[PDB]
C-alpha cells in the first residue's frame, strides 16, 4: 500500500502489475481523511474465504454470474482490497426484519 | 415416432449419413456402444435366428400369462402351436410377426434354449463383433471360405483353422429334425 499526496506520474503507475503474485494498491491522501465505512449509510461488508464462497453457491444452487455484484473500483471494495472473484457478505439493518444477509461478488 | 436412447445434438447441418454395409458400419442407432434405459452402457444385441425364435416366443408366452392374471376380475407342429400363441397375444394385424414367426421358425437351427445356450457360450469367446456372432449362428457353413466370404467383416480377425473348428462344433450341435 502506497500513499501519494497530490498525485503519481502516469509513467510510474504502469509498474504495479509487473511482479506477480505480489499485489500493490494506490491511495490518495484526501480520500483516506475520512473512513467511508463509518458513514450512516454504508453498512458493513465481509470477505469470504474461497471456502465460504464455494459454499454460498452450493447452498443457493447458484452459478457465479447470477450473483449480485460489486465494482472492482467500488469504494468499499478498495477499503478491503477485493480481487475479481472474491465475494463479500453484506449484512445490513431492515425495517422489515432487523438484519438481512446479502452477497456481492466482484467484477 | 419411437425415440431412441440418445439425443444426438443436431446442429442444423445434418449431413454425413455414412454407408450401411458389412464393413460393420451400421446406422448411428447401431454402434456397438449403445445406452440402456437404466443409464448404463451395453454391447449391441445380436440375435441369430432360432435364438430370436426363442426370445419372441418367450415373451409372447409370458404375455398370455399376465394376460390372464387380470381376466379373473417338431417342425410343422410348431406352425400351429404358434399361430395360436398369436391369435391370442398378437395384434391380429401384425401380418409381419406372423411371417416373422414362420421364417424364424422354419429356417431356425435350434430347439433347445440349452443348445442355443452353448452356441452362445461358444462364439462369445471370439471377441468378434455381434453382427458376425450372429450371421455365424444362423448361416450354414462348411468351409472357412463359405464363411469368410459371406461375412467379409471377418477376413482378418480370425485364422481359417479356428473359424473352422467352430464351424465343426456348429454342425455337431445343430439340432436335428
Amino acid at each position: 500500500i502506497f500513499v501519494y499526496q497530490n498525485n503519481i506520474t502516469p509513467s510510474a503507475m504502469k509498474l504495479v502489475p509487473s511482479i506477480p503474485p505480489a499485489t500493490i494498491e494506490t491511495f490518495n491522501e484526501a480520500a483516506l481523511v475520512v473512513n467511508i465505512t463509518h458513514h450512516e449509510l454504508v453498512p458493513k461488508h465481509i470477505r469470504l474465504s474461497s471456502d465460504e464462497k464455494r459454499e454460498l453457491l452450493k447452498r443457493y444452487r447458484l452459478k457465479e454470474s447470477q450473483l449480485p455484484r460489486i465494482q472492482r473500483a467500488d469504494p468499499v471494495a478498495l477499503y478491503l482490497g477485493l480481487k475479481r472473484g472474491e465475494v463479500v457478505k453484506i449484512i445490513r439493518k431492515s425495517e422489515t426484519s432487523g438484519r438481512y444477509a446479502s452477497y456481492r461478488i466482484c467484477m | 415416432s419411437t425415440s431412441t436412447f440418445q439425443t444426438r445434438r443436431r446442429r442444423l447441418k445434418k449431413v454425413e449419413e455414412e454407408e450401411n454395409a458389412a464393413t460393420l458400419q451400421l446406422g448411428q442407432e447401431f454402434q456397438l456402444k449403445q445406452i440402456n434405459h437404466q443409464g448404463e452402457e451395453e454391447e449391441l444385441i445380436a440375435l441369430n435366428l432360432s435364438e430370436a425364435r426363442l426370445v419372441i416366443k418367450e415373451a409372447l408366452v409370458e404375455r398370455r400369462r399376465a394376460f390372464k392374471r387380470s381376466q379373473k376380475k417338431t417342425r410343422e407342429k410348431e406352425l400351429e402351436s404358434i399361430d395360436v400363441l398369436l391369435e391370442q397375444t398378437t395384434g391380429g394385424n401384425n401380418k409381419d410377426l406372423k411371417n416373422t414367426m414362420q421364417y424364424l421358425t422354419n429356417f431356425s437351427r435350434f430347439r433347445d434354449q440349452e443348445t442355443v445356450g452353448a452356441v452362445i457360450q461358444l462364439l462369445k469367446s471370439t471377441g468378434l463383433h455381434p453382427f458376425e456372432v450372429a450371421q455365424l449362428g444362423s448361416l450354414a457353413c462348411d468351409t472357412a471360405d463359405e464363411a469368410k466370404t459371406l461375412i467379409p467383416s471377418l477376413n482378418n480377425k480370425i485364422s481359417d483353422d479356428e473359424l473352422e473348428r467352430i464351424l465343426k462344433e456348429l454342425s455337431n450341435l445343430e439340432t436335428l429334425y
Binding site: K63 | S1, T7, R9, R10, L12, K14
Partner: protein, 97 residues
C-alpha cells in the same frame, strides 16, 4: 374488444397463467404450424392427409413437430425471415440451466 399490454400486466400480476394464455390464444389468434426438428423453421410441407411431411433443404420426413402459436407470431417470424433473419423454433432444451 381489447386485451392489451396493461390488462396483461395485471394477469401476470394476479399470477393467472392459463387465463392469460387463453385470452392470447384460444380467444384471438391461435394457429397450428409445423416445424423441422432440424432447422427450426416453418418450411415443412404438411399434406395432412397422406401424412406426407418432407422439408427438403434440411430434408426430412421423420423428425417433424407441430406447435400452436399466435398467428401474429408466425407472421412476426415470416416477416423476420424475409429480412433474412432466422428465428429457430426448437422443441427441446439442449443448453441446460
Amino acid at each position: 374488444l381489447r386485451f392489451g399490454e396493461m390488462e396483461r400486466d395485471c394477469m401476470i400480476a394476479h399470477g393467472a397463467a392459463s387465463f392469460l394464455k387463453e385470452r392470447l390464444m384460444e380467444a384471438s389468434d391461435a394457429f397450428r404450424v409445423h416445424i423441422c426438428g432440424i432447422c427450426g423453421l416453418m418450411t415443412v410441407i404438411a399434406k395432412l392427409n397422406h401424412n406426407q411431411f418432407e422439408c427438403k433443404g434440411c430434408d426430412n420426413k421423420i423428425d417433424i413437430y407441430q406447435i400452436h402459436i399466435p398467428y401474429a407470431a408466425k407472421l412476426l417470424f415470416q416477416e423476420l425471415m424475409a429480412m433474412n433473419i432466422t428465428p429457430r423454433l426448437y422443441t427441446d432444451r439442449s443448453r441446460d440451466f
